[PDB]
C-alpha cells in the first residue's frame, strides 16, 4: 500500500468533473489519467478536446500539465472512460481545481503517515461521508473533538501523531 485513490468511488459517475493530467496525443484521441482515482486510463476525443486555430494542431502545451474534464461514459468492466473538456462549464472549471488541492492536501497528509488504502476506510471517506468533504471540517478537528463520533482507526498509535499534524494551519 503505497498509492491509493482519493474518493470512495472506484470510478466517477457521469456528469462528474475531475482533474486529469495528459499523457500523450494520438491519431484518435488524447490518452490521459485521472488523478483522483489513482491515474487510471482515459481517452479524450479530438472533437471533444478544446477547440483550435491551427491547420493540424501540434501545440502540445497541454501534453504535460493537469487539465479538467467532465465524464461522458464509463465501462467499469474494461477500464474505458470517455471524457471531454469542450463541454466543461467555464466557471465550474475552477470548482474542480478549488475542490482539488484540498483533496490533494489530504492525500499529502496520509502519504507522509503512510510510508494507506485502509486509512480512508477508517477516517477519510466516512468523514467525507459525515460532513460535506474532508476539508470543510478538518480545520474543526483541531478545534473540536466531537469530530471523531464513530471513529475507529487501527489504534491511536499513529492517529495521535496525526492529531499533532493537523497543526499546519
Amino acid at each position: 500500500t503505497s498509492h491509493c485513490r482519493f474518493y470512495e468511488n472506484k470510478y466517477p459517475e457521469i456528469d462528474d468533473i475531475v482533474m486529469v493530467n495528459v499523457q500523450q496525443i494520438a491519431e484518435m484521441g488524447a490518452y490521459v489519467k485521472l488523478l483522483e482515482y489513482d491515474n487510471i486510463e482515459g481517452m479524450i476525443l479530438l472533437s471533444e478536446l478544446s477547440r483550435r486555430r491551427i491547420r493540424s494542431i501540434q501545440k502540445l502545451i497541454r501534453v504535460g500539465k493537469n487539465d479538467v474534464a467532465v465524464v461522458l461514459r464509463v465501462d467499469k468492466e474494461k477500464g474505458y472512460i470517455d471524457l471531454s473538456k469542450r463541454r466543461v462549464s467555464s466557471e465550474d472549471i475552477i470548482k474542480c481545481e478549488e475542490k482539488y488541492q484540498k483533496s490533494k492536501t489530504v492525500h499529502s497528509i496520509l502519504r507522509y503517515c503512510a510510508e494507506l488504502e485502509e486509512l480512508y476506510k477508517t477516517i477519510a471517506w466516512p468523514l467525507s461521508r459525515k460532513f460535506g468533504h474532508a476539508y470543510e471540517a478538518f480545520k474543526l478537528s483541531i478545534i473540536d473533538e466531537t469530530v471523531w463520533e464513530g471513529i475507529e482507526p487501527p489504534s491511536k498509535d499513529v492517529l495521535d501523531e496525526l492529531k499533532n499534524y493537523i497543526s499546519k494551519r
Binding site: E27, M43, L45, L46, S47, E48, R73, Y80
Partner: protein, 317 residues
Amino acid sequence: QGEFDIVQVYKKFLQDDPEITMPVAAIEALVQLLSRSQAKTISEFMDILQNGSNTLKEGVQNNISLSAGCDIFQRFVTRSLHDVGDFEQCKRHLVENGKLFIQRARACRQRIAHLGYPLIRDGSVILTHGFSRGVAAVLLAAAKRHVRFKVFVTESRPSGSGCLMTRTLKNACIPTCMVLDSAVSFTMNRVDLVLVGAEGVVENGGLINQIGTFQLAVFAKHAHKPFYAVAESHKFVRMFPLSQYDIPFSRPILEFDDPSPETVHAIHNELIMNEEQIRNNPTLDVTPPEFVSGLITDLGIIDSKSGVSEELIKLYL
C-alpha cells in the same frame, strides 16, 4: 468467432472482387469490424480500429496506399463525431459516415477517367509505366469515346507489370508497343504525353510509385513533353521525403559484396539478375513535384503542388 481475422474479410473482398484495389478493401473490412461490434464506449471503438488498422497495416508489407487509406479513413470518422444524449448515435454516425467514405472511395476511379480522357487527343501518342488501374480507366474511357491513339508500355522491372498492362489495353483494341526499361529516352521524341499511376502522394506534392517512375519524369522534362500522374485521393500520405531517396525500406537496399581472394575460375534474354540480387534492388522511386505537369485526382486536376498540401491537410482533419 465474433470478428475473425479481418484480413480474411480483407482477403475475401479481393476474391469477391478483383477489380477493386487493396485500399478500398480494408475500408470495406473496417466498416464490417465497426458494424459487427458493440463497444459501449467511444474509447473501445477507436481502440479497436487502431489495432484493427495496425493489424491490416502489419499484415501487408506496410503497403503505402493501404496504410494511407486506413489512416485517412479513421480521421474522417472521428472528425464530426460527437456523443449527444444516447449512445447508439455513435456507432450509427460511424458506420453511416463510414459507409459514405467507401461509396465516395470506390467511385473515385470513375471521376478520374471522366477528367482524364480529354488529355488523350486524336492521334496522340501516350507513354505509361507499368500497370496501373488509374491509367487503364482513362485510356479505356478514351477508346470507348472513339479516339485514335497509340501508347507505349515499359517493361517495368522488377514488377514486370508491363506485359500485363500491355494486354489489358490490347483487349480493348488499342495499339501497344512494349519498351524495355533501358530505352524510354529513345522514344520520348515520338510521344506527345506521359501518363502514369501513383502508389503514393506526399506532402511536397511528390510522387511515390514504381521503381521506374522518376526515370520517365526526367526524360519528359528534358524532352519538353508533359508528365501526368493519376492518383486517388486516399493515397495522400503524411510524409515528407527530403531528397528523392529518403523513403522507408522494408528490406535493406543496394549493398555490396566483400570479395576476398576466391578465383572461382546481340540479344541474350536469358542473362538476367537472379531473384536474390533483384531483391537487393529497390522497388519504388519518388518523383519530385517539379517534374509533374499535373496531378489528376477525384478532387480534380491539381497543378499547384502547393495546394496538394492544402488538399492533403483538408483530409487529415
